[PDB]
Amino acid sequence: DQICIGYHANNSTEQVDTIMEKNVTVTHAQDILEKTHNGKLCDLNGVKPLILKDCSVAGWLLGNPMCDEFIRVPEWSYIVERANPANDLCYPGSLNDYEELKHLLSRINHFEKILIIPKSSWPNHETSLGVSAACPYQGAPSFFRNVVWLIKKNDAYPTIKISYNNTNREDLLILWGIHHSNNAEEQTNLYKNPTTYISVGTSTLNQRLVPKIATRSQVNGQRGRMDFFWTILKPDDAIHFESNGNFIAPEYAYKIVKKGDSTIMKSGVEYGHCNTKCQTPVGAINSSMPFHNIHPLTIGECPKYVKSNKLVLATGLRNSAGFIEGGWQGMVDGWYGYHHSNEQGSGYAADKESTQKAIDGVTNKVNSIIDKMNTQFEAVGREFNNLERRIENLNKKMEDGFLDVWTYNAELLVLMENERTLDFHDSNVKNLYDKVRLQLRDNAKELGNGCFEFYHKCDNECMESVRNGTYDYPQYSEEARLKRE
Amino acid sequence: DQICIGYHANNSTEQVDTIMEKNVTVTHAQDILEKTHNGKLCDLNGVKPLILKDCSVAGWLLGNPMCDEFIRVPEWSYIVERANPANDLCYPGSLNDYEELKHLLSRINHFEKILIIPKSSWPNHETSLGVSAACPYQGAPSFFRNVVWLIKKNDAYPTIKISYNNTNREDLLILWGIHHSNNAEEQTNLYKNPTTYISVGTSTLNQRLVPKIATRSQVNGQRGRMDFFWTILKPDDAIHFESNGNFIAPEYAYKIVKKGDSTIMKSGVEYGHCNTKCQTPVGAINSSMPFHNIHPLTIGECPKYVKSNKLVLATGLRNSGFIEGGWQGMVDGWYGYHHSNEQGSGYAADKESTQKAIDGVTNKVNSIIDKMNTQFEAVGREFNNLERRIENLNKKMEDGFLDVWTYNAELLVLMENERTLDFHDSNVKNLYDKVRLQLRDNAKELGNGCFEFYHKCDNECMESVRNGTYDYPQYSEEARLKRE
Amino acid sequence: DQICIGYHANNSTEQVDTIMEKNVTVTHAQDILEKTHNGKLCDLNGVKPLILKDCSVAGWLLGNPMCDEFIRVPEWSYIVERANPANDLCYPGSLNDYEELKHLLSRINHFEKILIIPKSSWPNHETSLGVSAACPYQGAPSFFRNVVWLIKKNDAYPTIKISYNNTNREDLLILWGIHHSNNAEEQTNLYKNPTTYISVGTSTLNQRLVPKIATRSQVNGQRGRMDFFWTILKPDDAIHFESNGNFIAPEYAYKIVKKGDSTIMKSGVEYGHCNTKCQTPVGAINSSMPFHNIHPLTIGECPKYVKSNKLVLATGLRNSGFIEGGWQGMVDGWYGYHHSNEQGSGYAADKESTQKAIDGVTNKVNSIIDKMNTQFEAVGREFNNLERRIENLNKKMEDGFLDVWTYNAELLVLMENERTLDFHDSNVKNLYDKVRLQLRDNAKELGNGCFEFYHKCDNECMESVRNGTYDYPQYSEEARLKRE
Ligand SMILES: *[C@@H]1O[C@H](CO)[C@@H](O)[C@H](O)[C@H]1NC(C)=O
Ligand SMILES: *[C@@H]1O[C@H](CO)[C@@H](O)[C@H](O)[C@H]1NC(C)=O
Ligand SMILES: *[C@@H]1O[C@H](CO)[C@@H](O)[C@H](O)[C@H]1NC(C)=O
Ligand SMILES: *[C@@H]1O[C@H](CO)[C@@H](O)[C@H](O)[C@H]1NC(C)=O
Ligand SMILES: *[C@@H]1O[C@H](CO)[C@@H](O)[C@H](O)[C@H]1NC(C)=O
Ligand SMILES: *[C@@H]1O[C@H](CO)[C@@H](O)[C@H](O)[C@H]1NC(C)=O
Ligand SMILES: *[C@@H]1O[C@H](CO)[C@@H](O)[C@H](O)[C@H]1NC(C)=O
């Protein structure tokens, strides 16, 4: 007749690795790595992205004829540009500080196109003949919609002096430009004056733009260039333009309210009509998990990116070395338990108030690991041009350096803490074995099989008494002494 | 008679968290995070900062007539500016590469102003009428002091050619400027020449400045602009100027000796006459702790910034077995003995086990604290309105380090608090098993962490249990008779 | 007569630290810090570096007469420059975006010089008279090899109009320049037109360079300057030039194909005809270790730089318990027994317990090593003197990761070293308990980790305890008679 102390077992094929042991098969386990994404672009904390479809920020702002998605997205959380946007700056040219404009325009609380300078304001200039084939609507010469290309009237280009005073109590992104002619004849056939200039003036702005007339290669059919510039006119300031020619003048402008920053996501996944806290270029994540293996370029309150394919914590115990050779599959109601063998019956009876302390403790470990990184911050990817490659490497080295920090720390944490969990189970069961012993030492033989050879025949009642620690060895003393000497 | 094994307890309400348990009351604790700061701007490693009051670096450098208060301080460690300096450039304009000059001048080991180009070097030119309302000394029209605004003399502005050969064995910060007019009438009225230029050339510098005459909105009453430029002249180089107008000419210059760098601190906190190794915009830290939560924009050998409000390490044993009782009566050691015999009762601590634990617990805390080995660096924010991308790259960096340090500092505390509390438990068990091995069968293992002496033990054999000098033969027969 | 439980000891003087215990001498150890290099510059993953001996990238790209080691390498993994290169721009001047060109040229998969504008293309200009004493070759005036300094012919400089269509299926790096003359007399002597220009135009380039005729300081004996500009002409694009004068015309251009990035290294070390995955300026690393203390500025897949001088993990046994005592005589194992009987005294080891430990501590060391992500390709970057703020940003990042990696590594060693020692203590105690249950009421627990056999035990009887097959009945009555 004997009683034994044991640990739970099940059908789990789940494996965890530890610092000193690999491919340990455990009963229960929880992966702290989120590997799933919805596959759709979604809203970020309630606000909808500005999905410029085959358009660029420059083409959308200046008003490329081919771009016809609604300018009326009043607020956005991030801009979604396709990589290599199809339609951008139809007339060959540039936009100064495109990348800084895009950054400002990444998250905008209020975007309202207003007309600041009417086409009626150019009485001595022609507003209808500033078109090019390169910028084409329905197979006809057209131009940028929100900017005007002014040419001569009656072989004359009288000097322009104009001003717009922002009266709107809201900042204004005003876009203007210069046309670079290809020859002196082209200069005198669109403008009339040979030497030209553009002056732009605000409180912060002093500009002098002179055309560069020289032979250039042809892009989109034209050997001339249009270089655009921008400023943010403050609530009560005036912008002053002066030109004797070569002026792509502002007609429309944009009201800007700037509160918060984001990035331009480059992706092709469709808007899924959803909301998320974390947005990847390939999908969106809904998770409290601490780490993720999806995409480096994430926007929102996102998990930390690591290179791991799996990060399996151990929420349970081993499946079938120590004094207790194996696990009892038949035990169902507890992790730690007793086995009573006597004449009345032999069965498995688990010990709660030991399993319960274990399940709460291991659960708190998992939750402490998951929640103590509530350091989740708003973060984004970035964009740098082809003459900022050195700054790009700083970004790559920072992003890669943080990756290697988390990947090493996370895996070691999993390996270190999983070992402690498995030994915490081995320590917990010995405390049950030691509690049963030290209460019946003389009456049973410590076989070391995890079992005690009960010299005294114990009924089902003293089994529960041993479980409750209420075994009186005087009550059962001599029946064991007869088997003893 | 019986002898008991147990641990110490006290009045402390200090609570610590482990990775597996929360709100665990312990006898002693240690927070490894610093929340206390001086509340004053102290000197950094012996050097007093350059506190500019309602002054910007540009206004202090160029000589804003309202900014001349801090003219003679030979060296400094960091520059203190208010968030919105009120004086700055009286005549509207700019200073090229301002934020790089600010960085260069954040830590200077020698600054001295010298007269490089006297006002007597400008005959045939006028040194007296270059004054504006925007720059005001005692309500009177004035202008920047360290630079000169030359204007025409006798309705003529002769082209001037001037050179300065630095001879001072130290580098010279030379500033100069161009005045952008507003109309052709303003130009001729100030400099008879209509088309103008400023050529500036050193060994490293080739500069051509031509004025931008155009209408602009007004600020500080003037619609014109003064764009300023600077260069560092190496100790045996010369700077060569040439202009036919619009030349804001250097009069004074500064000897620079830069042997290190810091940043500009934006703060209005008063100057306390103190010394510190770590300074924040809100105060100074002299802690040796690894982590801190005072301010992000620290400057110096500072702890690591974390988002925690508390980081409490367990240095005690009150909570977290079959010995589940903590003796509040024991007042001399962490682990100890309790003897109950017919002679009396008493508490006595195991000094060996207690001191071994104390020195080990103190090493665990000292390991975490002293292994940090922080480096010196400054965390100022020094990027302009068209440099926002670099500004975010700094933000993601210093926020990415926040998340690394906070997550690791928190778990380190949780992880090592568990080991500490189980270190205490196992140290208790070692005392129990020590006592058990001596009393093989001469006493009964009660199971509550105590032993029931079968024989009778006086106070001196109780001391034999403490000293490991218990004689099993002496009480063996007496105890054997006690059984049955 | 007695059997015992203990651990192995040797001559090892290796000292490690734990979180609670300092300077503990162990039997076996392993340092996870790499502290050695080969002292030579090696190939990076099978690709030779471009070693510009006392040459700058400008002096090699432009044809400095003394730097003109024409390319023998079609590709390179990184560029090795000296700290202060000695040749560079012989005629004083500048190269636009020099630091970004050095990033692009830092790793090149294929590089081939080609003649794009033959000197036969200039029939109305003098291609032979453009030399200077600033650029000397073999005692004679020379100039840059890969560019032509066109001057006037027959007191006439007709406006230049030239175009080069790229037809090479590869991108072309083209370099041109502008000469800044010192006076109007010099301008009319070398060129004839007094007001000049240089227009350069591709699909992505619109440029207008005008000379800066002004007095400058004398560098390399010349007060003139030559400012060079570069572009990358895409495979089916044309560059267009137009110059009134002051034109330093492209003669030779370079084919560029670019597939990776790898910084420029400043080292005086000599090439060693070797290959590595990790390179430092001091030497090259051949390590699988997680961390290193060799040089901050590495290139390749490298361990992590830290400030530590040693990161010694413990794989041994000594001086971790109350089964204390080390047996120097117990070779051939880590855990085992000491048998003392009339037949003699000897040691024996528990093979299964020892092997389970050496495999456990081996995995611990290999887990700390293998979980390292072997980084990526790496760099030490370079910024110029008006970019000191970004340098500070790069400094903060590199120094920030140091403090992160050092602290995490050091404390990881301290934490895992404690439990490695406690792993041995608990494994020894498990052998003690295994023997005690076989020796039930046949010996007495002395408490020092040794069992005094009540009966008399043979040599083979001792072996039965190790074997796990000790018959309590066979020696039952003898021990009862020895217990009085
Ligand atoms: C652990 O299991 C995986 C999956 O079968 C296997 O790839 C790996 O080799 C195993 N680890 C060891 C040490 O055998
Ligand atoms: C711990 O203590 C604080 C203060 O009483 C209490 O608000 C908090 O709920 C407690 N946390 C837990 C898990 O009991
Ligand atoms: C624009 O209008 C406001 C109205 O108060 C006026 O103060 C201002 O002078 C104008 N701003 C200019 C010319 O900068
Ligand atoms: C300045 O004076 C010294 C006197 O020896 C002279 O060598 C040096 O050339 C001068 N510097 C310049 C730029 O002329
Ligand atoms: C130290 O002990 C080992 C065997 O344990 C032996 O091989 C080695 O030679 C000894 N080292 C020295 C310096 O004596
Ligand atoms: C540990 O060993 C080193 C080298 O012998 C010694 O400098 C140091 O003082 C020792 N540490 C302590 C706490 O004794
Ligand atoms: C260059 O050559 C090809 C083939 O003749 C031609 O199609 C192309 O237009 C040329 N490009 C330029 C910019 O001249």
Q: What is the DSSP string of B231-294?
A: EEE-TT-EEEEEESS-EEEE-EEEEEE------EEE----EEEEEESEE-SS-EE----SEE-S
| Residues B433, B435, B436, B437, Cα dihedral to 10° | 90
CA atoms within 13 A on the CB side of C449: 22
- Residue A398 shares a structural domain with residue A436: yes
- Residue C288 shares a structural domain with residue C263: no
Single-letter code of the amino acid located at A19: I
Q: What is the number of the ligand 7 atom nearest to the C-alpha of C163?
A: 14
Euclidean distance between CA atoms A429 and A324, whole angstroms: 9
Q: Is residue B169 part of a domain?
A: yes
- Residue A133 shares a structural domain with residue A256: yes
Among B252, B232, B69, B256, which Cα is nearest to B145's?
B252
Q: Given the structure tokens 């702890």, which residue do they identify? A: B303
Euclidean distance between CA atoms B230 and B173, whole angstroms: 7
| B159 contacts on C by Cβ (under 8 Å) | none
Euclidean distance between CA atoms A237 and B385, whole angstroms: 18
- Residue C20 shares a structural domain with residue C83: no
Euclidean distance between CA atoms C103 and C79, whole angstroms: 10
Nearest-Cα residue of chain C relative to residue A307: C373
Q: Is residue A388 part of a domain?
A: yes
8 A C-beta contact, residue C333 and residue C350:
yes
Q: Is residue A479 part of a domain?
A: no
Euclidean distance between CA atoms C105 and C87, whole angstroms: 18
Strands (E) across B303-461 are located at 304-305, 312-314, 326-327, 335-341, 344-349, 376-378, 443-445, 450-453
Q: Report phi then psi at C432, rounded to 5.
A: -60, -50
Mutate to test the pocket of ligand 2, among B23, B26, B310 (most ligand atoms within 8 A of CB): B23
- Taking phi over 0 as left and psi of -120 to 50 as alpha, with beta for the rest, A273 belongs to left
- Residue A7 shares a structural domain with residue A82: no
8 A C-beta contact, residue B43 and residue B276:
yes
- CA angle (C439 as vertex; C433, C443 as ends), nearest 5: 110
Length of chain C, please?
Answer: 484
Euclidean distance between CA atoms B88 and B95, whole angstroms: 11
8 A C-beta contact, residue B157 and residue B137:
no
Q: Between the CA of residue A208 and those of A135, B180, C257, what are the distances in Å?
A: 27, 12, 38
Among C460, C459, C452, C458, which Cα is nearest to C435's?
C452
Among C200, C135, C152, C149, which Cα is nearest to C179's?
C149
Euclidean distance between CA atoms A321 and A334, whole angstroms: 20
> Pick from B223, B239, B268: which residue ends a domain?
B268
Euclidean distance between CA atoms B217 and A222, whole angstroms: 36
Euclidean distance between CA atoms B134 and B221, whole angstroms: 6
Of A395, A402, A434, the CB nearest to B393: A395
8 A C-beta contact, residue B7 and residue B335:
yes
Euclidean distance between CA atoms B300 and B46, whole angstroms: 12
- Taking phi over 0 as left and psi of -120 to 50 as alpha, with beta for the rest, A10 belongs to beta
Euclidean distance between CA atoms B262 and B81, whole angstroms: 13
Q: Between the CA of residue B42 and those of B84, B283, B328, what are the distances in Å?
A: 21, 8, 46
Start-to-end CA distance of chain B, whole Å, equals: 17
Residue C179: burial class (beta carbons within 10 Å; 0-12, 13-18, 19+) = buried
CA B478 from chain centre, in angstroms, equals 71
Q: For strands A79-81 and A50-51, give the pairing.
A: parallel
- Residue B291 shares a structural domain with residue B425: yes
- Residue B12 shares a structural domain with residue B77: no
Among C430, C110, B390, B455, which Cα is nearest to A321's?
C430
8 A C-beta contact, residue B264 and residue B378:
no
Q: Indicate whether residue B120 lines ligand 2 (CB < 6 A).
A: no
C418-443 burial, b for 16+ CB within 10 Å, e for fewer?
Answer: bbbbbbbbbbbbbbbebbeebbeebb
Q: What is the distance in angstroms between the Cα of B347 and the nearest Cα belonging to chain C?
A: 24
Dig out the tokens for C404 from the structure.
Answer: 């992160």
8 A C-beta contact, residue C263 and residue C377:
no
Q: Sign of the CA dihedral A433, A438, A442, A443?
A: negative
Start-to-end CA distance of chain A, whole Å, equals: 18
Say whether residue C400 is in contact with chain B using an 8 A CB cutoff.
yes
Residue C78: burial class (beta carbons within 10 Å; 0-12, 13-18, 19+) = buried
Euclidean distance between CA atoms B343 and B458, whole angstroms: 7
8 A C-beta contact, residue C436 and residue C336:
no
- CA angle (B252 as vertex; B249, B255 as ends), nearest 5: 125
8 A C-beta contact, residue B166 and residue B172:
yes
Q: Sign of the CA dihedral C408, C410, C411, C412?
A: positive
Euclidean distance between CA atoms A444 and A323, whole angstroms: 17
Cross-strand partners of C4: C450
List helix spans (H) across B35-140.
57-62, 98-104
SS3 C266: strand
8 A C-beta contact, residue B247 and residue B209:
no
User: Max alpha carbon distance in chain C (Å)?
Assistant: 132
DSSP secondary-structure letter at C262?
A: -
Q: Given the structure tokens 């965890």, which residue do they identify? A: A16
Per-position DSSP letters for C86-150, written without gaps between them: S-S-SSSEEETTHHHHHHHTTSBSEEEEEESS-GGG-SSSBSSS--EEEEEETTEEE--TTEEE-
> Pick from C225, C242, C268: which residue ends a domain?
C268
Euclidean distance between CA atoms A87 and B422, whole angstroms: 66
- Residue A461 shares a structural domain with residue A313: yes
Euclidean distance between CA atoms B167 and B186, whole angstroms: 39
Q: Report phi then psi at A214, rounded to 5.
A: -160, 165
Euclidean distance between CA atoms B402 and C152, whole angstroms: 64
Among B331, B278, B313, B320, which Cα is nearest to B409's?
B313
- Residue B103 shares a structural domain with residue B24: no
8 A C-beta contact, residue A3 and residue A466:
yes
B308 CA → ligand 2 middle, Å: 16
- Chains touching chain B through at least 3 C-beta pairs below 8 angstroms are A, C
Whether C383 sits inside 8 A of A390 (CB atoms) is yes
Among B241, B61, B246, which Cα is nearest to B164's?
B241
Euclidean distance between CA atoms B396 and A304, whole angstroms: 13
Q: Is residue C43 part of a domain?
A: no
Q: For strands A444-446 and A451-454, give the pairing.
A: antiparallel
Query: What is the CB neighbour count within 10 angstroms for residue B446?
Result: 15
CA atoms within 13 A on the CB side of B305: 20
Q: Compute the radius of gyration of chain C from its Cα atoms.
A: 38
Query: What is the CB neighbour count within 10 angstroms for residue A171?
Result: 18
SS3 A38: coil
Q: Report phi then psi at B369, rounded to 5.
A: -75, -45
Ligand lying closest to the C-alpha of residue B362: 6
**C100-104: which pairs have CB atoms within 8 A and are 24 or more residues apart?**
C100/A387, C100/A388, C100/A389, C100/A390, C101/C57, C101/C61, C101/C230, C102/C57, C102/C264, C102/C382, C103/A389, C103/A390, C103/A393, C103/C261, C103/C263, C103/C264, C104/A389, C104/C232, C104/C256, C104/C258
Q: Between the CA of residue C261 and those of B154, C102, C103, C257, what are the distances in Å?
A: 62, 10, 7, 12
Euclidean distance between CA atoms A122 and A150, whole angstroms: 8
Euclidean distance between CA atoms B479 and B472, whole angstroms: 10
Resolution of the determined structure in angstroms stands at: 3.2
Q: What is the distance in angstroms between the Cα of B442 and the nearest Cα belonging to chain C?
A: 13
Dig out the tokens for A381 from the structure.
Answer: 């990817």
A359 CA → ligand 1 middle, Å: 28
- Chains touching chain C through at least 3 C-beta pairs below 8 angstroms are A, B
Single-letter code of the amino acid located at B379: V
Among A74, A140, A79, A146, which Cα is nearest to A111's?
A74
Length of chain B, please?
Answer: 484
8 A C-beta contact, residue A243 and residue A160:
yes
CA atoms within 13 A on the CB side of A214: 27
| B97 contacts on C by Cβ (under 8 Å) | 386
* CATH, residue C55: 3.90.209.20
Euclidean distance between CA atoms B17 and B15, whole angstroms: 7
> Pick from C268, C303, C318: which residue ends a domain?
C268
Single-letter code of the amino acid located at B276: T
Q: What is the number of the ligand 7 atom nearest to the C-alpha of C237?
A: 13
CA A289 from chain centre, in angstroms, equals 13
Query: What is the CB neighbour count within 10 angstroms for residue C158?
Result: 14
8 A C-beta contact, residue A19 and residue C364:
yes
Which amino acid residue places its CA nearest to atom 13 of ligand 6? C22
Q: Is residue C430 part of a domain?
A: yes
Which amino acid residue places its CA nearest to atom 3 of ligand 2? B23
Per-position DSSP letters for B301-343, written without gaps between them: E-PEE-S-S--EEE---S----S--EESS--S-SEEEEEEETT
DSSP secondary-structure letter at A39?
A: S
Single-letter code of the amino acid located at B155: D
Euclidean distance between CA atoms B295 and B286, whole angstroms: 14
Residues 6+ apart with CB under 8 A from B466: B337, B348, B350
Whether B215 sits inside 8 A of A206 (CB atoms) is no
8 A C-beta contact, residue A280 and residue A44:
no
Euclidean distance between CA atoms A48 and C250, whole angstroms: 52
Q: What HEC string does A99-144 produce?
A: HHHHHHCCCECEEEEEECCCHHHCCCCECCCCCEEEEEECCEEECC
SS3 A348: strand
- Residue C327 shares a structural domain with residue C196: no
Euclidean distance between CA atoms B158 and B125, whole angstroms: 8
Q: Is residue B43 part of a domain?
A: no
Q: What is the distance in angstroms between the Cα of B138 and the nearest Cα belonging to chain C?
A: 38
Per-position DSSP letters for C158-223, written without gaps between them: PPEEEEEE--SSSEEEEEEEEEE-SSHHHHHHHSS-SS--EEEE-SS-EEEE---------BTTBS
Q: For strands A264-266 and A206-209, give the pairing.
A: unpaired
Start-to-end CA distance of chain C, whole Å, equals: 17
Q: Is residue A167 part of a domain?
A: yes
Q: Sign of the CA dihedral A318, A323, A326, A330?
A: negative
Q: Between the CA of residue A93 and those of A179, A225, B36, B146, B282, what are the distances in Å?
A: 9, 5, 57, 43, 49
SS3 C341: strand
Among C105, C41, C44, which Cα is nearest to C302's?
C44
**Please, after which residues is chain B broken with C–N above 2.5 Å?**
320
Among B3, B15, B23, B7, which Cα is nearest to B425's?
B7
Dig out the tokens for A354 from the structure.
Answer: 């030991």
Among B285, B233, B416, which Cα is nearest to C18's?
B416
- The residue segments making up the domain with residue C297 are 2-36+283-482
* CATH, residue C448: 3.90.20.10
CA B256 from chain centre, in angstroms, equals 26
Cross-strand partners of C33: C291
- Residue C224 shares a structural domain with residue C299: no
Whether B363 sits inside 8 A of C20 (CB atoms) is yes
Say whether residue B390 is in contact with chain C using an 8 A CB cutoff.
yes
Say whether residue C100 is in contact with chain A using an 8 A CB cutoff.
yes
Q: Sign of the CA dihedral C24, C25, C30, C32?
A: positive
Domain total of chain B: 2
Residue A169: burial class (beta carbons within 10 Å; 0-12, 13-18, 19+) = exposed
Q: Is residue B282 part of a domain?
A: no
- Residue C254 shares a structural domain with residue C337: no
8 A C-beta contact, residue C379 and residue C295:
no
Kind plus residue range of the DSSP H or E element containing A96: none
Q: Between the CA of residue C103 and those of A99, B458, C261, what are the distances in Å?
A: 21, 86, 7
8 A C-beta contact, residue A319 and residue A27:
yes
